[PDB]
Amino acid sequence: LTNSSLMPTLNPMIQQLALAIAASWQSLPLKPYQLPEDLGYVEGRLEGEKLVIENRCYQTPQFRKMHLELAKVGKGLDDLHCVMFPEPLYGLPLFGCDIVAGPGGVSAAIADLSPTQSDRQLPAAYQKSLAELGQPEFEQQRELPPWGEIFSEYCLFIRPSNVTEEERFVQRVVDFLQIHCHQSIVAEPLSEAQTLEHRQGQIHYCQQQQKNDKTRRVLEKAFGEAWAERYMSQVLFDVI
Ligand SMILES: C=CC1=C(C)/C(=C/c2[nH]c(/C=C3N=C(/C=C4\NC(=O)C(C)=C4C=C)C(C)=C\3CCC(=O)O)c(CCC(=O)O)c2C)NC1=O
Numbered sequence: 001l002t003n004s005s006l007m008p009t010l011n012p013m014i015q016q017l018a019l020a021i022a023a024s025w026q027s028l029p030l031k032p033y034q035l036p037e038d039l040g041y042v043e044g045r046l047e048g049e050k051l052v053i054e055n056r057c058y059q060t061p062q063f064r065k066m067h068l069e070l071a072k073v074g075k076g077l078d079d080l081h082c083v084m085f086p087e088p089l090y091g092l093p094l095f096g097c098d099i100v101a102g103p104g105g106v107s108a109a110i111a112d113l114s115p116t117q118s119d120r121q122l123p124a125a126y127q128k129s130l131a132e133l134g135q136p137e138f139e140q141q142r143e144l145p146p147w148g149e150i151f152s153e154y155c156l157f158i159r160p161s162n163v164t165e166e167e168r169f170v171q172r173v174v175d176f177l178q179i180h181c182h183q184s185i186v187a188e189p190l191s192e193a194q195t196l197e198h199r200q201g202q203i204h205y206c207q208q209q210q211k212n213d214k215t216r217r218v219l220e221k222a223f224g225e226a227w228a229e230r231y232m233s234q235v236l237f238d239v240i
Contacts, residue, residue: 005041006054006070011101013109013166014070014080017173021068021082021097024177025058033057033065036234044223049074051222055235062090062184064240073218076102081236084180086116088198088240090187093122093152094205095180097173098215106166108142111173112155113180116201122152125186129179130154136172138165147211150204199240206237 001007001022007015035057043052051073058066065085072078077100084095097111113130115122122130130152140159144151151157154176160166190198210232219228233239 004054004070006052006072009072010070010080011078011099011106013106013160013170014078014099014101016170017080017082017097017099018068018070020170020174021177024174024181025066025068028058028181029060030058030066031060033059033067035067036230039235044227046222046224048221049076051218060184062087062092062187064088065238067236069236071218073222077218078102079218083236085202085240086198088116088195088202089189090184091116091123091190091194091198092180092184092187093126094202095176106160108157109160109166109169110155110157111169111176112151113176114151114155114205116198116205118197118200122154123183125183126179129183130176133172133175136168138168145212147208150208203239206239209237 001018007018035055039055041054043050045051051071053069053071056068060066063084064087067083069081070079071081080097080099082097086092086094093116094114096114098108099106100108113122113126117123121127138158139161142157142159144155144157156169156172158165158169160169216228216232219231
């Protein structure tokens with residue numbers, strides 16, 4: 001991320017989370033993942049503010065697509081988006097996070113390891129490791145929208161209230177990533193029927209995430225409806 005144009009000007013929590021995600025991935029057996037049109041940086045404006053986006057995307061045998069996206073709208077909204085999309089053959093959950101900030105601080109911080117099983121449960125080893133982290137305390141919890149039924153019982157959705165909480169959230173993401181990368185070492189290829197189950201779960205996750213009209217509006221204001229639909233369905237939440 002040394003080379004990032006956006007990083008120097010992003011919200012400090014976002015910066016730390018980008019660094020933590022990059023550090024988690026850094027020594028993995030990474031290969032490039034070409035986004036549509038081999039997208040990297042993109043900017044657009046219509047009648048209002050400009051939206052700037054920086055994309056990074058990789059893959060490994062266990063992760064179909066590892067997407068880290070940074071964005072800024074004019075000087076007023078920052079976003080970090082990340083999803084690690086699993087290879088269904090290994091049945092790992094989906095790591096994701098979305099962090100939205102403005103000049104007044106972080107408004108929204110979401111992170112999860114989301115299920116892909118038909119029973120909507122995380123694998124047993126994830127349940128146990130997550131539980132052992134304890135229930136974090138956060139003073140300003142936010143209720144997920146209906147489409148957020150896709151998220152696990154361990155999902156975080158907060159407005160951080162102070163620096164202590166920002167740090168606690170970052171540390172929880174670090175802990176999620178650590179559990180996830182360890183479980184990916186001990187995962188084995190699954191049966192054809194299980195693979196199919198996990199693929200279904202990932203498809204559903206993406207279809208539900210596409211219902212987030214707050215994200216869609218940011219994209220639309222800078223690029224328009226058609227661009228935004230392409231971006232959400234082909235770049236952010238591609239349905240396998
Ligand atoms: C260009 C990309 C991009 C932008 C611009 C973006 C914006 C964005 N996401 C938001 C919410 C949100 N975002 C999520 C969740 C997620 N969203 C994800 O992309 C992932 C991976 C998760 C979860 C793992 C949820 C649950 C909300 C709240 C939606 C609501 O309040 O209705 C909001 C509202 C913030 C608030 O209410 O304080 C905005 C503006 N998200 C993006 O990804």
